[PDB]
Amino acid sequence: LVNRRYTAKGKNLPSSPKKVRPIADNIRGESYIKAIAVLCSMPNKGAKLLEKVVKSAASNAMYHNKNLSEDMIFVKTVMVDDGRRRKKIWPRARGRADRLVNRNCHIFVEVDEKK
RNA sequence: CUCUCCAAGGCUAAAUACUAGAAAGCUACCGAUAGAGAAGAGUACCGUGAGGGAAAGGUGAAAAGAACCCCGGGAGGGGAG
Q: What backbone phi and psi angles, to 5 degrees, belong to A110? A: -125, 130
Give the nearest nucleotide to A62, CA to C1'.
Answer: B70
End-to-end CA distance of chain A, in Å? 18
How far is the C-alpha of A50 from the C-alpha of A44, rounded, in Å?
A: 10
Q: Is the CB of A10 under 7 A from strand B?
A: yes
Method used to solve the structure: cryo-EM
Q: At what angle do helices A45-64 and A32-41 cross, to 10 degrees?
A: 150
Q: Is the CB of A7 under 7 A from strand B?
A: yes
Tell me the structure's resolution in angstroms, rounded to a single decimal: 3.4
